[PDB]
Every structure is written in C-alpha cells, then in structure tokens.
C-alpha cells in the first residue's frame, strides 16, 4: 500500500511575478484537495507586511478632499494600499513622504530604513497640479497575516484615534491571485488520475515558487504533531 | 509567524462504529481547511480488509441455486460483500464457514483464525431451512484501499481462474460517513481559536486515532513533493 508520488515537470514563468506550476501526476481526487488547501492557506494565512495606517494633514476623513492634487483622497488611499513593502526586523514602522513641485510622486521618494525597502520604486501614488503644493503623509507599516478590511478593522478597534487618521485596508498576504486548474493526466495503467496546474500571480517581496514552498511548509508544520 | 499546533484531545465513541474525535487548537482559517482535507483523504484512501473471493462447495456460478438455503447465491455474495472484518497480522487470509441444521448463518459462525477478528457477530448471511442442509464456503479476505471490481480483477488476472471461485467485488474502505465541525475553541488567553470536531462513522474495524494519523501521514507525504521540489 504505497501512493503515487508526483514529479514537478514544468514551471512556466510567464513574467517576473507569474507562474504556472504544473504538478503531475497525483492520485484520483488529490489535486482538488491539495489545490484547495494551498489556496485557502495562501489567501488567509500567509504572513507579510503591508500599509495599514496613514495620517495626512489637511484632510479629516475619506469623504473630504485636498487642493493641489489630481486624484482624490480615496484614490490616494487606494494607491497606498497597492504598495508592496517588506519589513525584516520589526513589525511596526512609521514612514514619511514629503514632495513639492510638478511631477508624479512615486515610491522611490519616501524615506527608507535599513530593513525597510520598496520593491516597486516606479509605483505611482499621486500627482500635483500646483508648484506650491506640499503633500505630506505619515505611513504606518504594520505586519500581520491574511487580509483584514477597514470595515472589520473599525468594528474591532475601540480606541479613539485623532481625526485625520485614515483607515486603509491591509494586503498582508503577498499573493495577489492564485487559481488552480485540475486537469486529467495519464499513466499507462491508471487513466483515472489527474494533474494540478496552479496559476499564481503575486506582488513583490516574494517569488511564486517560494510562496508555494512557504505555504506547504506552513501546512506541514500544522500537520507535524500527529504523524507517524 | 504566530502559529499554534493542534493535538488530539478527546476521542469519545458514542457507539462501537460511530466515534467522534476532536482536534484542538487551530488558528483562524485553518479549521475548515484541515477539516475538509482530512475528510476527503479519509473518505478516499483508507486501507481496510474486505471479502474478495468466495468458494461455496458444489456451486459453479453465482446464478445457481443451492438446495437447502433460502437466499439465492447472488444474495449470499451481496451479504458477504457487506461483511466487515479486521485482519491483524497478515494481508491475505482464508476463512472457513461450516454450518448445518435449521437456522440463520450469522457472521459469528465463521471459524476465524488466530489473527482475524470479526467485528459484527450479528451479520446474517444465509437462512438454512432444511434439516439435512449444509454449507461450507472458503471465504478469502484481501487487504487494500479503494474499490476494485470483478471486471478490473479479471482484467488484471493473467493467470487462470478456476471454476467455483465466485468473484465478489471489493469495497476496501471502512469509512462510510464523516462530517467535521468548526466550533469556538476554549483557550484562556485567545478568543480567536477554533476547534475541530470530526464526527467519524467507521465500519467498526479501523481505529479513529489511527485513521486521523494515517490521513495526516498521507497528506504530509503528498506535501513533501511541494516542500522539496520548488
């Protein structure tokens, strides 16, 4: 009574942060189990760092506005959520950004710590219409796991922050989208087997093969107790 | 990395077959994942023992009718496919069932060996009616997993098959029904932990703690190929 160990035959790297990790052949009814387990772990359990809290002077809430800018404060918060940050040592870093003049302010303008770096320096955050426009923010970079929205964040928190502290969502997990496709493979005896094709696309700080390896490491560490 | 590890805490057998087994504690978002994965593995690939060949004396094919018994021989083969047994030591045993006189032929009348334990001594196989009636079958119990039918077995049998071996289909898996539950775990400093309550229902042969440990062994063996090779 011995199972059928798979053999990794293909990693078709579409882009610098894309992958098609074909893994054939598995037992009948195991590709769905492995794919669903890895998808749930990567979507709601993989740890990472993300922008969580931002304080911008001149505005009081997300329904307000600012002068001297093209986009609004809602699109500013959206572009700040889309930022991909890595923090190595600590788990709560406060970052500042001050820019004046005509030009698209990017992620290469902000201050960086020794363990805090940005993997997309060309990430556009906002723009300025006025030469005298001075946009200022204080960006708090937390560290968690999974995904917590601002609605359940304000419903779980209870302290009264100073008004002007904007709540943005937290993209804690580094994988942006993973979708598995279970095909049907063939060994010459057993034609009823299958084949797992994981299409994973992440943001920076993590390569997709390392993401799947860390997810499998997390599931193995969770299962580690009741083994032979 | 603030993960916690689960452990088998309570194993309560409500019946001899139905056996609820808990798992505690699990992080938020891991109860449903581990519960669904363990349910799929335990329903698909649990190794057990089942009746594979039956050789009734004086009977050529399954569609015959023996004199003395009430049930047809196809009904005897279905009642023997429904038999539950647990072979301890070997992987291929041969049982013997000799019975005469008037009365039902229960499963407890099987002359078991030193390492073959029948778990259901009320499984009625036949119904003997005549006083001079007799039945002497040589049941063969294999060991495997899954469902191996008679057509697959006669395709994979390159050697000859004699006349008399009524080939019974093989349902090896001893787990018939299983459902988990993700409750709220009681931990004195964390309120965001969820326990897993797996309400198994086996054939009476397998051990539930051995079933969960074998399922986790299969899952870890399959994830070794994900950890190692990229």
């Amino acid at each position: 009574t011995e199972f059928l160990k798979p053999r990794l035959v293909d990693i078709e790297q579409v882009s610098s942060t894309h992958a098609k990790v074909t893994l054939e052949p598995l037992e009948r009814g195991f590709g769905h189990t492995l794919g669903n387990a890895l998808r749930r772990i990567l979507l709601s359990s993989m740890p990472g760092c993300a922008v969580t809290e931002v304080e911008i002077d001149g505005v009081l809430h997300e329904y307000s506005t600012k002068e001297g800018v093209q986009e609004d404060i809602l699109e500013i918060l959206l572009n700040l959520k889309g930022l991909a940050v890595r923090v190595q040592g600590k788990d709560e870093v406060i970052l500042t950004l001050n820019k004046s003049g005509i030009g698209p302010v990017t992620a290469a303008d902000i201050t960086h710590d020794g363990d805090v770096e940005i993997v997309k320096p060309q990430h556009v955050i906002c723009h300025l219409t006025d030469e005298n426009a001075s946009i200022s923010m204080r960006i708090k970079v937390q560290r968690g796991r999974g995904y917590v929205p601002a609605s359940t964040r304000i419903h779980s928190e209870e302290d009264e922050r100073p008004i002007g502290r904007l709540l943005v969502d937290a993209c804690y997990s580094p994988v942006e989208r993973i979708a598995y496709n279970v095909e049907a493979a063939r060994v010459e005896q057993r034609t009823d087997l299958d084949k797992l094709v994981i299409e994973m696309e992440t943001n920076g700080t993590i390569d997709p093969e390392e993401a799947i390896r860390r997810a499998a490491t997390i599931l193995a560490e969770q299962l580690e107790a009741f083994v032979d | 990395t603030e993960f916690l590890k689960p452990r088998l805490v309570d194993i309560e057998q409500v019946s001899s077959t139905h056996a609820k087994v808990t798992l505690e504690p699990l992080e938020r978002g891991f109860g449903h994942t581990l519960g669904n994965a363990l349910r799929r593995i335990l329903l698909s690939s649990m190794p057990g023992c089942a009746v594979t060949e039956v050789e009734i004396d004086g009977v050529l094919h399954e569609y015959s009718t023996k004199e003395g018994v009430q049930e047809d021989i196809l009904e005897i083969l279905l009642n023997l496919k429904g038999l539950a047994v647990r072979v301890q030591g070997k992987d291929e045993v041969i049982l013997t069932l000799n019975k005469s006189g008037i009365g039902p032929v229960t499963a407890a009348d099987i002359t078991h060996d030193g390492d073959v334990e029948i778990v259901k001594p009320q499984h009625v196989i036949c119904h003997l009616t005549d006083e001079n009636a007799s039945i002497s079958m040589r049941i063969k119990v294999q060991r495997g997993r899954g469902y191996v039918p008679a057509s697959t077995r006669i395709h994979s049998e390159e050697d000859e098959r004699p006349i008399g071996r009524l080939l019974v289909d093989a349902c090896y898996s001893p787990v018939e029904r299983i459902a988990y539950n993700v409750e709220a775990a009681r931990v004195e400093q964390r309120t965001d932990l969820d326990k897993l309550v797996i309400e198994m229902e086996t054939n009476g042969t397998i051990d539930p703690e051995e079933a969960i440990r074998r399922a986790a062994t299969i899952l870890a063996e399959q994830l070794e190929a994900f950890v190692d090779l990229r």
Partner: protein, 50 residues
C-alpha cells in the same frame, strides 16, 4: 400534509438543506433542494449503442 410530515421527521420545512461543497469545503450560497427520488434505469445501454 407534506410540510406536516416534514415537521414530524425533524427536517427543514422548506424542503431544502444547506449543502456544503464536498470538493472545496465551502457552503453553497443558496439552500439546495435535497430529497429521495425514485430513479429508473431504461433499456438503452451504451454497450448496445456504441
């Protein structure tokens, strides 16, 4: 009378249970009608048609 029989048998009176997806573990967003139907097997067999 059907709903009275369903309320005797300790079942949901609307006839539909909350089916979980066996493939991925998640719950279907709507209640699905579950119940026993008497299915036949007609005499048009694919061994005789192919």
């Amino acid at each position: 009378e059907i709903k009275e029989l369903l309320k005797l048998g300790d079942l949901p009176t609307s006839g539909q249970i909350r089916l979980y997806d066996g493939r991925t573990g998640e719950q279907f967003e709507r209640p699905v009608t579950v119940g026993y139907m008497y299915m036949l097997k007609l005499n048009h067999l694919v061994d005789d048609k192919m």
